[PDB]
Design a protein around this ligand. Structure first.
Ligand code: YKN
Ligand code: CA
Lengths: 557, 410
């Protein structure tokens, strides 16, 4: 049928005319198919024959597509699409099953020939004009235009959706407690009615749907007990991911490894513990798609640790809006994190992992916070409120850092939970200069042409040293001078640098880095009992800083 | 005596398309408040439901009026503004009185509800589109456009200017020394009257408005109490090598900005290669330098002027223990104004309050809002900022995950 629904006004892009693409010639077979199909279509109101009064044409063709040995009719709308106004949305978000509230019953209804069931504008139909061609383009083609939404036209998903929403409103208003999710061609209908009365209510819906043009060619409410949707398996009362056979090979191509990671990444939203860093490590420096990568020892451990977790199935529960959400986070691996969200203890609505990147250098307190933050956004989207957090960090560990740290932050209400490892500060820089500690005027200098660097220091105790360096920037010779001070210093030490840059990095109390000079420094910093870091400005001829420059830039520049 | 008025033609900037901004995820209670607000707005003919043939979007937020008293709907027209506002504030701008900052008292009145009277140009309405999202993307989401002038939007006061002139004229005639400035949904009212009596004049002004569509409007700023005197140079600061070194760095930097910073008597005193904790073999001619230097830091940066054709930008540093420092400049460190905000908890609560307070100063001062550099994670600000926002505008913001030793100087 065709919906009695009011049509959506559509217009071409500003100052642009409809498409006038010349129809290429088709094989007899394909023509015959086209004529047959169009006839059926013309009969059902979908299509309409038209004069040569209409300019405009958009090529048609036909083939065996989706094994269609009954023949399918295609329209290349490229040209019309470039010429049709953008529409809203297209669609741009989908629900996460962990947000669904538990139902007694849900059924799928597939809409018949959805697009073909919705009227096209009319002031616009003219542009959708197409031409079934003559045997050897000798004679005029049969010219039609669309009266309904065509298959590959820019606006068919948006208008259908729009049309379906309107259509559904009166039924939703008369049935305020029934849940309908529209996804493309399908409707999922969820209720808390008893098996028999739910079936009644579907039939009513089907009836409302027929009144509006839309057949649900599924009589007796078709479906099948477990809904499969967007990589999930959904039941009225629980949910999961669907397959996840991890193959059994000695040889993994890069390709295999990608697929595998994607799969594990998918699983990890309901399987707590899933871990993939060693598998991702195998992927560094992409070495061709078809190529085998020997699994490291560290990877084989993970792959098995993973098969372990996927041994038996797990299901998420659904959301009771009356209870709080709780988010638990656990440190697991290096920059890696895992989390569970749940309402009654250990019935996960869902699960996840976080493995950040938010800088060259960072620390656990930061990264736990960014994870907390990602979960907070995820919660608002999924459940429309924020979870109460449980965290492997002492209240004082967090307050110390964040009250000290220069950036601002805020997290939802939370508690400490003892799920080792805990987040701590491996070292605290000192706030004041240390009485009776050797003060180390460290300085660097690189030539930027030759790259020849001198990194050294001078001390208040008279001690000095300059060691030569080679493939360095002015910047590394700062970090090398500072590190050089940390090696040759006792347990307590003051360090004066003139590097804005180097001071920047260390002041943020990192515990990890994508620089090697830096992981080194952090090692030193942990071993020390007291480190004070102070900043003076370059070549201003300062006491202490002057002298290191006399013998750093001599061999420097 | 009951039908609509006649509409000003409105063009988007030369070959520019409307806003297609993603709506941010919102809390259930806020969604609720939002459909409830919009249901009225629709019944009152202010907004209409739109179809899919409108590809435009502009985010919407709900905020509390004071705290749990009511919800207000807030529309983020920053993008729509940008695409309307190289060409307005020109064809139909509103000049800014210099005298406003010199008044003893400026009171901010929200005259936003007035705009809902004037109809919006038919061919411009599509650009005002916004979406009420659903939780978990379970539902497509309620879409609307505007029929009357919208409050978030810089074209509104521009169109409405004429009515505001007529509305306001009698009042101004009767008090020619009151300074009234319109910026978006608010009027800024400035006068050198004593505080009560100022307020009486505000009330009187409120009645002139009330006759024309303003449902009992609206504060208090005292601009001539807005102080500069920042960059501080310690007092028992003439003891250690570390003190002096820090002090020298503070001055070294200040001499970027401020013409006259001496510093040399000070570079001595250090002379050697001393331990950080040694007290000093000098404190004489240098103390005079320190004196002089300090006194130039009390006063305005001599070299620097406001250029009306340039974005004001504002930096904020977290000083900790509830203190925040901030700078307004058009090019880094040519500071137009520097300041403080303190609450003596949260961090983002205070920050949003800081931003708001700064924006208002900037408005009363220059008739623009600054582009803010915010010392926070983007994600965190996005999540939380509407929780404390109370104003009707939104300034532009960057996030600055760095801060140099800039925090120290300030
Ligand atoms: C399967 C299930 C369990 C609990 N409540 C529901 S409600 C729903 F059917 F509308 C619905 N079906 C959906 C399919 C995909 C995404 C969201 C859905 O909501 N559904
Ligand atoms: Ca240096």
């Amino acid at each position: 049928p065709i919906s009695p629904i009011e049509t959506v006004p559509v217009k071409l892009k500003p100052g642009m005319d409809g498409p006038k693409v010349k129809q290429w010639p088709l094989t007899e077979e394909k023509i015959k198919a086209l004529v047959e199909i169009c006839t059926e279509m013309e009969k059902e109101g979908k299509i309409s024959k038209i004069g040569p009064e209409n300019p405009y044409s958009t090529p048609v063709f036909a083939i065996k597509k989706k094994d269609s040995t009954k023949w399918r009719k295609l329209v290349d709308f490229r040209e019309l699409n470039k010429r049709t106004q953008d529409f809203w949305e297209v669609q741009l978000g989908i629900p996460h099953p962990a947000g669904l509230k538990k139902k007694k019953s849900v059924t799928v209804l597939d809409v018949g020939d959805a697009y073909f069931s919705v009227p096209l504008d009319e002031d616009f139909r003219k542009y959708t004009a197409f031409t079934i061609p003559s045997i050897n383009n000798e004679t005029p083609g049969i010219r039609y235009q669309y009266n309904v939404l065509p298959q590959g036209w820019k606006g068919s998903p948006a208008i259908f959706q729009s049309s379906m929403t309107k259509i559904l409103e009166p039924f939703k208003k008369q049935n305020p407690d029934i849940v309908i999710y529209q996804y493309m061609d399908d409707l999922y209908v969820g209720s808390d009615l008893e098996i028999g009365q739910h079936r009644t209510k579907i039939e009513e819906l089907r009836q409302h749907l027929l009144r509006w043009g839309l057949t649900t060619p599924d009589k007796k409410h078709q479906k099948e007990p477990p809904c499969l949707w967007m990589g999930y398996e959904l039941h009225p009362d629980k949910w999961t991911v669907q397959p996840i056979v991890l193959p059994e090979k000695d040889s993994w191509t890069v390709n295999d490894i990608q697929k595998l990671v994607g799969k594990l990444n998918w699983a990890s939203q309901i399987y707590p513990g899933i871990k993939v860093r060693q598998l991702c490590k195998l992927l560094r420096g992409t070495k061709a798609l078809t190529e085998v990568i020997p699994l490291t020892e560290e990877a084989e451990l993970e792959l098995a640790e993973n098969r372990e977790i996927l041994k038996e199935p797990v299901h998420g529960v659904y959301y009771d809006p009356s209870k709080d959400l709780i988010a638990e986070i656990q440190k697991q691996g290096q920059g890696q994190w895992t989390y569970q969200i749940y309402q009654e203890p250990f019935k996960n609505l869902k699960t996840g992992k976080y493995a950040r990147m938010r800088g060259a250098h960072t620390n656990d307190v930061k990264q736990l916070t960014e994870a907390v933050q990602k979960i907070t956004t995820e919660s608002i989207v999924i459940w429309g409120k924020t979870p109460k957090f449980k965290l492997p960090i002492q209240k004082e560990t967090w307050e110390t850092w964040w009250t000290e740290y220069w950036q601002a932050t805020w997290i939802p209400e939370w508690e400490f939970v003892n799920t080792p490892p805990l987040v701590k500060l491996w070292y605290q820089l000192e706030k004041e200069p240390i009485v009776g500690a050797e003060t180390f005027y460290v300085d660097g200098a690189a030539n930027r042409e030759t790259k020849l660097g001198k990194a050294g220091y001078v001390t208040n105790k008279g001690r000095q040293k300059v060691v030569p360096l080679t493939n360095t920037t002015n910047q590394k010779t700062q970090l090398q001078a500072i590190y050089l001070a940390l090696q040759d210093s006792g347990l307590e030490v003051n360090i004066v640098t003139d590097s804005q840059y180097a001071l920047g990095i260390i002041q943020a109390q990192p515990d990890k880095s994508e620089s090697e000079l830096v992981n080194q420094i952090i090692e030193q910093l942990i071993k020390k009992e007291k480190v004070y870091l102070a900043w003076v400005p370059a070549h201003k001829g300062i006491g202490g800083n002057e002298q290191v420059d006399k013998l750093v830039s001599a061999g420097i520049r | 005596p009951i039908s609509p008025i006649e509409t000003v033609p409105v063009k988007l900037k030369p070959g520019m398309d409307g806003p297609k901004v993603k709506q941010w995820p919102l809390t259930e209670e806020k969604i609720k408040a939002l459909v409830e607000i919009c249901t009225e707005m629709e019944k009152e003919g202010k907004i209409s439901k739109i179809g899919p043939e409108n590809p435009y979007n502009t985010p919407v937020f709900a905020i509390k009026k004071k705290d749990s008293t009511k919800w207000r709907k807030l529309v983020d027209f920053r993008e729509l503004n940008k695409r309307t506002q190289d060409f307005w504030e020109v064809q139909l701008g509103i000049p800014h009185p210099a005298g406003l900052k010199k008044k003893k008292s400026v009171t901010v009145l929200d005259v936003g509800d007035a705009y809902f009277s004037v109809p919006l140009d038919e061919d411009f309405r599509k650009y005002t589109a916004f979406t009420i999202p659903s939780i978990n993307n379970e539902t497509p989401g309620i879409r609307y456009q505007y029929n009357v002038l919208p409050q978030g939007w810089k074209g509104s006061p521009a169109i409405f200017q004429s009515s505001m002139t007529k509305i306001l004229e009698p009042f101004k005639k009767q008090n020619p020394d009151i300074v009234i400035y319109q910026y978006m949904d608010d009027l800024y009212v400035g006068s050198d009257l004593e505080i009560g009596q100022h307020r009486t004049k505000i009330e009187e002004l409120r009645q002139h408005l009330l006759r024309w569509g303003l449902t009992t409007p609206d504060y208090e700023l005292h601009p001539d109490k807005w102080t500069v005197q920042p960059i501080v140079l310690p007092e028992k600061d003439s003891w250690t090598v570390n003190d002096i070194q820090k002090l020298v760095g503070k001055l070294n930097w200040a001499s970027q900005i401020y013409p006259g910073i001496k510093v040399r008597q000070l570079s001595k005193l250090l002379r050697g290669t001393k331990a950080l904790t040694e007290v000093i073999p000098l404190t004489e001619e240098a103390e005079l330098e320190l004196a002089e230097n300090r006194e130039i830091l009390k006063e305005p940066v001599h070299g620097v002027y406001y250029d009306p054709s340039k974005d004001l930008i504002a930096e904020i540093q977290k000083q900790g223990q509830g203190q925040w420092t901030y700078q307004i400049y058009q090019e880094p460190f040519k500071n137009l104004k520097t300041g403080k905000y303190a609450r003596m908890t949260n961090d983002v609560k205070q920050l949003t309050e800081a931003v708001q307070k700064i924006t208002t100063e900037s408005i009363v001062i220059w008739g623009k809002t600054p582009k803010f550099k915010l010392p926070i994670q983007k994600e965190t600000w996005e999540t939380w900022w509407t929780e404390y926002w109370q104003a009707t505008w939104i300034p532009e913001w960057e996030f600055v995950n760095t801060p140099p030793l800039v925090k120290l100087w300030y």
